[PDB]
Amino acid sequence: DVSYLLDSLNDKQREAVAAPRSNLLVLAGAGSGKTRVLVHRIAWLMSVENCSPYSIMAVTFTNKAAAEMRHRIGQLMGTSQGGMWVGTFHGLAHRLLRAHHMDANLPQDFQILDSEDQLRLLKRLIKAMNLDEKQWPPRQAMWYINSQKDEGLRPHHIQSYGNPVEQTWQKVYQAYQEACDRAGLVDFAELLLRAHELWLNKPHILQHYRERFTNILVDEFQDTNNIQYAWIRLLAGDTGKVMIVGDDDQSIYGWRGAQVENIQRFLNDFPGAETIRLEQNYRSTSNILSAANALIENNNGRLGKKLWTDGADGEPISLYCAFNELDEARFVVNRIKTWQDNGGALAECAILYRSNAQSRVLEEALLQASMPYRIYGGMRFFERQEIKDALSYLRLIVNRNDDAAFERVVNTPTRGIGDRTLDVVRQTSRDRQLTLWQACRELLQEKALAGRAASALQRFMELIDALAQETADMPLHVQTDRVIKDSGLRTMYEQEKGEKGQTRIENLEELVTATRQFSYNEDLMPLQAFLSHAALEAGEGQADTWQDAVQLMTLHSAKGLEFPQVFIVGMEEGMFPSQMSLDEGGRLEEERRLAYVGVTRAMQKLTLTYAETRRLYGKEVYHRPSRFIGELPEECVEEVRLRATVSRP
DNA sequence: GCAGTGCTCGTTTTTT
DNA sequence: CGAGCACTGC
Ligand SMILES: [Hg+2]
Ligand SMILES: [Hg+2]
Ligand SMILES: [Hg+2]
Incomplete structure (x- = not known):
């Protein structure tokens, strides 16, 4: 009912909630109730302009936000209101890459890389390239590579004209990707770019979405980077009508890729786009x-x-x-x-x-x-070390080629796989371009490792294979509980000194519970489904x-x-x-x-x-x-x- | 690998 | 000033 959605709202909020389907910029002041506008706007598009919930895609940046919105939409509305994509850039990007992983050149269960994971991977690669980690910092590499992707720039786009200072990084970046792609890994930035590229190369897919999502609402627009702006633009195309809400004055994430422009750029690349100020x-x-x-x-x-x-x-x-x-x-x-x-x-x-x-x-x-x-x-929570160790074991169960997961727990807890062994392994992966695991298999076969060590390395691989089977038909929080014990992690943190040791065990206890309470949904199996969740939802x-x-x-x-x-x-x-x-x-x-x-x-x-x-x-x-x-x-x-x-x- | 020790130098900042 | 942390000698 027209009055049901406009009466509680004020004069200029109504302007926004009731405007005609089109592109518009709702410049939300500080305590102006922008969310209320987004929620009410959506219910309006469904009730008044009579749009299908499947035609709506609201995008935010944080999960807190995504949830608050998904929550409020429900109460103003009758029930669940499924068919409506509500989420974050990364979340929605991740969703697309799962639905079209094959067309995206990604494997069934590709895994996501959180900062740490990514940081460590660079470190291993910079060293394996014989570069001075002292004057070629992984942290620096990371910034370069993320910044690059927030622009849709792949290694073969870098235009390092003559300074090897850049020609070098491009090298790193190229190796980083080659590696990631070989192991089925995808970092946060990748998620957006791969998605974006997906639409660029697969016309029917892009077509299918321009056809479905005609109503796009984006919050906090002043915090978007170049690729996100691009991703929206490409999706809105010529048909979609998008409402962007933002405050050019609360932009404070520029030091990480936020474009103060975008909020105006919107106005420019969109004639007819009006501006309602709250x-x-x-x-x-x-x-x-x-x-x-x-x-x-x-x-x-x-x-x-x-x-x-x-x-x-x-x-x-x-x-x-x-x-x-x-x-x-x-x-x-x-x-x-x-x-x-x-x-x-x-x-x-x-x-x-x-x-x-x-x-x-x-x-x-x-x-x-x-x-x-x-x-x-x-x-x-999902970034604490005791949790990542545990997850890396589950991660190995899903895919033996997860170099990041392998490098993390192969000798964690210590099981005799030392540095001289791992040094041989990491080099073989480079020279024979294989994933860590693959390399450990040929070396074992070839008997190129010191008997006792090799014997340990073996026992490890068997443990993971043994867990990948024995735990196939178990509830998520049973398979987790089993991996946490069989890995030897519990035993390790159980015997860790004082208060901290306690804390690390209580968390592993919490990881099982989180798994227990983990509500399914859908597209993928629970273990992968859950790993995606832990990578995208930090979790307090x-x-x-x-x-x-x-x-x-x-x-x-x-x-x-x-x-x-x-x-x-x-x-x-x-x-x-x-x-x-x-x-x-x-x-x-x-x-x-x-x-x-x-x-x-x-x-x-x-x-x-x-x-x-x-x-x-x-x-x-x-x-x-x-x-x-x-x-x-x-x-x-x-x-x-x-x-x-x-x-x- | 791990326990100690000697040495930085201070990222404004947090999401995914 | 000290948390964090690259270094060795066992
Ligand atoms: Hg005043
Ligand atoms: Hg519509
Ligand atoms: Hg004072």
Whole structure:
């Protein structure tokens, strides 16, 4: 019903939800409710323009997002609403490559490569090419190769004109691929490019999709890279009508491939594409939006817009100058204690910082105050070492040619397959262009390895073959439990020293549970299905989930969240903005955008703080306040301070 | 391979 | 300043 979908929505949201089928850019301000627009828009396309759920493809970047969206779509709607592709670039890209793996030149069960895996593979290849890992860093190689793919550039496209400095990397890249392709491996970047290329080379397939997906919605468009923009464009073609939602002002992932352009490029490569601006904010108080507005104007790129609210101005924005970094912490904690002692929840308080560096000091301060908290730093579940070791065994069960999985657990736990043995193996793979496993088979046959070692290498191969069979007809969480024991991993981590050893076992226990609860769906078998899941869904950092805890994280990982109380620390020049943005650049505007984001995360109160002194790795330093703090209105601001009042008793 | 030891130098930053 | 970490001698 037309009113069912438009009544709760505001004037300009309706504009977006009810516009005619076409290409349009919905420029979503900060607390404007863009998701609500995306959800309502989709239900509108189905109910009003009467489109088939199979004609809709909403794409996001994070899984959290994909889920929130898949969830909300359901409740506004009747039921499941299947037939509708909702997911992330990588996720949807992965989906296509499975459905058309053969036409994509990929094997049945190709496996995905997470950062680590990829990083290690480069290291092995750089060495096996006799290159100085000291002056040819894998980390560097990685950046080169990922950056290359985010442009659709394969090795035979690199135009290294004369500097071997580049002609060399191309070499690495060429080997990396040759290897990956030989083992059935695909990294994140590959997923998009292979998909893209897939449409380029197979007209009928591309045709089949242009025919199905006529309604495309893309969120966070300001964070797309060149190949994603391209992938969308190619799919929309001439028929598809795409709605892109974005904020050219919250783009803060440029240092990894995000194109500030794309949001405008859309407008250019799309005449007729109108632009609906959502500027009513239902998040913050008027002062916050004021300061927010003010700040962001200082940047020049911008497509323009002013966040406004119907709510009261609210409390002013508190600024604080602390002695040193350790005082700044106590300040934040005491404001929070007050919050709490007045009935405030801890989980409604967030302390934001620019660098992970800044968390240490904050925690002790919180801990000392016996104040519960949660940090959102790193180490996802499917990235912990005990988990990857386990997965690499399952990985070997699916495909013996998974060099990455082989290299990882062949001698993990130690089973006597040393370096002199593995050195021979890794070289044979190069010279006879074979996958590690293949090479171990010919060498064994040829008896080219030292008897005792060879005997060990053998026993290994037999173990994997034995598990690949014995475990064929078992439930996923049974096969997992068996592999975790037979691999010898449990025994290894069982006897690992103290607290850490404990933690690693409790996680292997969690891996089985995750497998148990793993809900099927479909296209592939559970083990592969599950491996794909673990590679694409990092999966958080465990329990301690019920406690009312204060929220700590970097500004980057606060994007999209909102808290009544938001504390931003380290607001000083030399830290925010810092190095790069100082000695000449322009990443500065990105830094002010990051700032802008932080500011627009506050609902009731914002407290910015900085110190006159902090011990920046090494000596004491004396930073002055971020220019950002000075770019906020004087009326919306309120400076707090402690003064030495010596009263003669 | 692994336990210790001597030496970096600080990536702003996190997704998949 | 120290977490992380390339180096050997067993
Ligand atoms: Hg339609
Ligand atoms: Hg001060
Ligand atoms: Hg104000």
